Nucleic acid binder design. Structure first.
Lengths: 76, 50, 51, 64
RNA sequence: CACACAGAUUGAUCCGCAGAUAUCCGAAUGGGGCAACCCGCUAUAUUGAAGAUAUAGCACACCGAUAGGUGGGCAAACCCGCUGAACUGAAACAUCUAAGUAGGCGGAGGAGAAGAAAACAAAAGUGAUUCCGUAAGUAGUGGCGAGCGAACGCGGAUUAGCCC
RNA sequence: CUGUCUGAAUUCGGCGGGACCAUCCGCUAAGGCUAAAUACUCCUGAGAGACCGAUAGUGAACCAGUACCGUGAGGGAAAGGU
RNA sequence: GUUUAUCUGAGGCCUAACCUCGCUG
């Protein structure tokens, strides 16, 4: 669904409390982006639907390490 | 970021030197074109300076 | 005048048949409810065909 | 189950030593500049719940 | 049951346990379909050749490198996770309650969850989790309205600690 | 606990003691497993009731989720005694 | 009053993320 492929981050359910404390159901969505990452150790291109928060940890560690860590736990 | 240049950059230059660029310039251009490598676990792996 | 029930033994099976109940996810719960209650006659497909 | 004590009545209405209920006075909130000092001095000491309201106050405080 | 016909001290009938056979539909799994039907392919044999037959193998997903293994679905309650109302009460009603209830979805076991301190406590101390009685309708919370409501400590059931 | 953004040090370190600060006290997060005491009955074996006795007790003591009603989901009886 | 290394407010240009089209990359 609308979940990250490398972390499994799902959406969140919450409220939409107004000024008069009126509450209504609401969905906090994940900032998913469809990037095209280049594998430097294999010269290959993959198309994932990762989030902007895990793009940050990709830039922090490396795409290979993030992929090898997401391979465990069943892509979650 | 913290990249290690491989061939040359117009404004960066001086290959084999740690450079700090904006995240999105090394990931979309330098990494795919082979000009730099994101090397955090390599500051010690760069032993060619010996 | 014309009544509300105009029988057709193919329009009946295409709407209430066993293969029409078993095709849906929520139509498959009708079978479970009827089997739990103990209905001797399941969906209209239980009516015998002409021999 | 257990009878719950009404909070509005438990925050007020302190019970006295033997059989009475002690409470405060009203009207001493925000317009005290035009009331005589006699009224403001009388409305300062604590009062007792009247016998006509004692049954309701005791039912609220869960002392039947 | 009745007119009968048969079996059975060579030991029947009957009971307990362990086996064989087990048509068609149905997850239905060779394709399809209007459930209990229709129509096939490859190997053999039957006039074998047309019309047809008898037996075996023919769905999907994963992994096993390959001979092959695992799972499809159904079904009481308990338990877990994801979602999730309104009537009602407030003698009206929107905050609140009803209620994380009813309902919907997925998985596992005889139980499940939790479980071994980045914990309580207070100048004295206890030492994993779970459940029962008090603490207590107390502290507190609340258009401070309706209402909601702990914890510390104490007494018991059981007791177990270990691996990266 | 996080939907989004930002983002620390390694033991004279880090967290907690109900805003917050200093001192004392306790613990050592960002890895995992773990029986017992606890909840239930589609069932199984044994046994009870100051429980019902055929308009009662399960809808159903009897060819009952049956006969009948509806297109369907579904609703749903009466009927014991020589 | 200017210079050097940063922040920010606006425009222009480049392609290398992102979008689209034509032949099959």
């Amino acid at each position: 669904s609308r979940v990250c492929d490398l972390t499994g981050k799902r959406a969140m359910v919450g409220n939409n409390v107004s000024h008069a404390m009126n509450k209504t159901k609401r969905k906090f969505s994940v900032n998913l982006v469809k990037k095209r990452f280049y594998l430097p150790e294999e010269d290959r291109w993959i198309t994932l639907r990762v989030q902007r928060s895990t793009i940050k940890t990709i830039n922090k560690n490396g795409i290979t390490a993030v992929l090898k860590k997401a391979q465990s736990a069943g892509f979650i | 970021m913290e990249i290690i240049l491989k061939q040359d950059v117009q404004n960066l230059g001086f290959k084999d030197d740690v450079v700090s660029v904006k995240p999105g310039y090394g990931r979309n251009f330098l990494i795919p074109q082979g000009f730099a490598t994101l090397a955090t676990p390599s500051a010690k792996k760069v032993l060619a300076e010996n | 005048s014309k009544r509300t029930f105009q029988p057709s033994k193919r329009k009946r099976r295409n709407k209430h048949g066993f293969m029409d109940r078993m095709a849906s996810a929520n139509g498959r719960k009708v079978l479970a409810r009827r089997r739990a209650k103990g209905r001797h006659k399941l969906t209209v497909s239980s009516e015998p065909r002409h021999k | 189950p257990k009878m719950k004590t009404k909070s509005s009545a438990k925050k007020r209405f302190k019970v006295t030593g033997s059989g009475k209920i002690k409470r405060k006075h009203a009207f001493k909130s925000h317009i005290l500049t035009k009331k005589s000092k006699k009224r403001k001095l009388a409305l300062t000491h604590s009062a007792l719940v009247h016998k006509t309201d004692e049954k309701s106050i005791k039912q609220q405080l869960r002392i039947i």
